[PDB]
Design an enzyme around this catalytic site. Structure first.
Site, mmCIF file in Angstrom:
data_model
loop_
_atom_site.group_PDB
_atom_site.id
_atom_site.type_symbol
_atom_site.label_atom_id
_atom_site.label_comp_id
_atom_site.label_asym_id
_atom_site.label_seq_id
_atom_site.Cartn_x
_atom_site.Cartn_y
_atom_site.Cartn_z
ATOM 1 N N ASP A 60 26.772 57.862 20.100
ATOM 2 C CA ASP A 60 26.216 59.237 20.164
ATOM 3 C C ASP A 60 27.221 60.182 20.835
ATOM 4 O O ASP A 60 27.656 59.864 21.969
ATOM 5 C CB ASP A 60 24.877 59.221 20.900
ATOM 6 C CG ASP A 60 23.989 60.413 20.608
ATOM 7 O OD1 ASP A 60 24.510 61.574 20.577
ATOM 8 O OD2 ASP A 60 22.774 60.172 20.424
ATOM 9 N N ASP A 70 27.150 61.769 28.634
ATOM 10 C CA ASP A 70 25.819 61.264 28.211
ATOM 11 C C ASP A 70 25.732 59.731 28.313
ATOM 12 O O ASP A 70 24.854 59.161 27.646
ATOM 13 C CB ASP A 70 25.474 61.757 26.798
ATOM 14 C CG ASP A 70 24.006 61.607 26.450
ATOM 15 O OD1 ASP A 70 23.163 61.569 27.398
ATOM 16 O OD2 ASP A 70 23.715 61.465 25.246
ATOM 17 N N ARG A 72 16.347 59.398 7.044
ATOM 18 C CA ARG A 72 16.570 57.941 6.897
ATOM 19 C C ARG A 72 18.054 57.628 7.073
ATOM 20 O O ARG A 72 18.902 58.530 6.904
ATOM 21 C CB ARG A 72 16.064 57.473 5.532
ATOM 22 C CG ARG A 72 14.549 57.497 5.437
ATOM 23 C CD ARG A 72 14.079 57.385 4.009
ATOM 24 N NE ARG A 72 14.423 58.562 3.219
ATOM 25 C CZ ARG A 72 14.365 58.608 1.891
ATOM 26 N NH1 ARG A 72 13.987 57.540 1.213
ATOM 27 N NH2 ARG A 72 14.691 59.712 1.243
ATOM 28 N N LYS A 119 24.639 56.057 29.097
ATOM 29 C CA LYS A 119 23.397 55.331 29.421
ATOM 30 C C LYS A 119 23.262 54.235 28.378
ATOM 31 O O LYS A 119 23.845 54.338 27.305
ATOM 32 C CB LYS A 119 22.178 56.247 29.393
ATOM 33 C CG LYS A 119 21.832 56.741 27.997
ATOM 34 C CD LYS A 119 20.911 57.927 27.945
ATOM 35 C CE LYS A 119 21.002 58.619 26.610
ATOM 36 N NZ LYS A 119 20.236 59.885 26.598
ATOM 37 N N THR A 163 20.360 63.115 30.934
ATOM 38 C CA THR A 163 19.040 62.598 31.385
ATOM 39 C C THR A 163 19.058 62.448 32.905
ATOM 40 O O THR A 163 20.079 62.071 33.470
ATOM 41 C CB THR A 163 18.688 61.325 30.609
ATOM 42 O OG1 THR A 163 17.285 61.133 30.758
ATOM 43 C CG2 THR A 163 19.459 60.104 31.061
ATOM 44 N N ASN A 189 22.766 54.753 24.512
ATOM 45 C CA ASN A 189 23.920 55.302 23.757
ATOM 46 C C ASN A 189 24.928 54.206 23.426
ATOM 47 O O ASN A 189 26.000 54.555 22.925
ATOM 48 C CB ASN A 189 24.617 56.425 24.527
ATOM 49 C CG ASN A 189 23.851 57.728 24.450
ATOM 50 O OD1 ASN A 189 22.638 57.718 24.257
ATOM 51 N ND2 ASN A 189 24.537 58.849 24.598
#
Ligand SMILES: Nc1ncnc2c1ncn2[C@@H]1O[C@H](COP(=O)(O)OP(=O)(O)NP(=O)(O)O)[C@@H](O)[C@H]1O
Ligand SMILES: [Cl-]
Length: 322
Positions: free
Chosen positions: A167, A149, A39, A151, A184, A154
């Site tokens: 991230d 990374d 959480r 995109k 990705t 993020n």
């Protein structure tokens, strides 16, 4: 004189801050949502009165999902960096059961869901977001950090309508080249696919992909099977929608440059070839950095379970550095 940004990053990189708070220092208000490993809870720092987003990462789950290196790397980068478009890690600690990332509470929206809902962004709106990424990659690259990374997923949009990169799992600090096949498919730079080594130029590739996706509503390279996407990235061309300005198409030809020795961001003038491009002629770079440009989109802003911490230490070894 921002050899001080570098000097300070390097102190924190060399001696990462550890156990800068503990659980008994926060009031638990409510659960905000669920992450990969547990959480995120809205908490009030008892001393200051400030609210934060406390991400609880179960160590046993992080090990089981083989996300140890990524978790450690993300925390280590986030306690070293300081830049307006990076999420702010306020405190971190661990206990027998969990890792804790006490993030700045950002009641914003998600770039991914805003892009998908609107369909596509105007060039001036794409350019506003793109300029935040350009200044961010300038910062990260000056610290020998390859983000690798980029995109929409993020990127979040804070309450001022500005970007924060959310991230750092994949980001690597490295001086020269590295080889890890990661990211990705739609956002992989060709030198990553071709497996002969890549450097920070892959971020400028990914910027090209993001600008295209913001301006068109879909990315330049896409297919039913990843191998078809790799084929397109490596030895396909790109097709620009007819609505794309000639300024935008020219920038994208030089960012989505398959040959990294000719890609904009990776030449003698470095980031200035992007900043001084026609497409960015209207962008006040200083004003974007200071969040003084009015953003085009401002986000609008019972089942509660206790935290149990074991009396027995879990995954001590795996998370020593945290
Ligand atoms: N800084 C924050 N401020 C406010 N809410 C947050 C913050 N960080 C996370 N949340 C909330 O917590 C939820 C789950 O955390 P999140 O950071 O999304 O998890 P994750 O493990 O990083 N995976 P992902 O959902 O793919 O990003 C989000 O959907 C938000 O509602
Ligand atoms: Cl991959």
């Amino acid at each position: 004189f921002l050899a001080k940004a570098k000097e300070d990053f390097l102190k924190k990189w060399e001696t990462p801050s550890q156990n800068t708070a503990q659980l008994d220092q926060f009031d638990r208000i409510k659960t905000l949502g669920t992450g990969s490993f547990g959480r995120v809870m809205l908490v009030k720092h008892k001393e200051s009165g400030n609210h934060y987003a406390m991400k609880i990462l179960d160590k046993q789950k992080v090990v089981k999902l083989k996300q140890i290196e990524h978790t450690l790397n993300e925390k280590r980068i986030l306690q070293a960096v300081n830049f307006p478009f990076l999420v702010k890690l306020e405190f971190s600690f661990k206990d027998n059961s969990n890792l804790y990332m006490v993030m700045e509470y950002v009641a914003g929206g998600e770039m991914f869901s805003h892009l998908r809902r609107i369909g596509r962004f105007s060039e001036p709106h794409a350019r506003f977001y793109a300029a935040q990424i350009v200044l961010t990659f300038e910062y990260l690259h000056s610290l020998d950090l390859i983000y690798r990374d980029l995109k929409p997923e993020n990127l979040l949009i804070d309450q001022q309508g500005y970007i924060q990169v959310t991230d750092f799992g994949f980001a690597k600090r490295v001086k020269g080249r590295t080889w890890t096949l990661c990211g990705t498919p739609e956002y992989l730079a060709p030198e990553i696919i071709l497996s002969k080594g890549y450097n920070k130029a892959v971020d400028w590739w990914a910027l090209g992909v993001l600008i295209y996706e913001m301006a068109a509503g879909y990315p330049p390279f896409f297919a039913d099977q990843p191998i078809q996407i790799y084929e397109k990235i490596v030895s396909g061309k790109v097709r620009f929608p007819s609505h794309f300005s000639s300024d935008l198409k020219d920038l994208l030809r030089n960012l989505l440059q398959v040959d990294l020795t000719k890609r904009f961001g990776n030449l003698k003038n470095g980031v200035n070839d992007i900043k001084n491009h026609k497409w960015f002629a209207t962008t006040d770079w200083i004003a974007i950095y200071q969040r003084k440009v009015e953003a085009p989109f401002i986000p609008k802003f019972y089942e509660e379970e206790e935290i149990r911490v074991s009396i027995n230490e879990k995954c001590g070894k795996e998370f020593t550095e945290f």
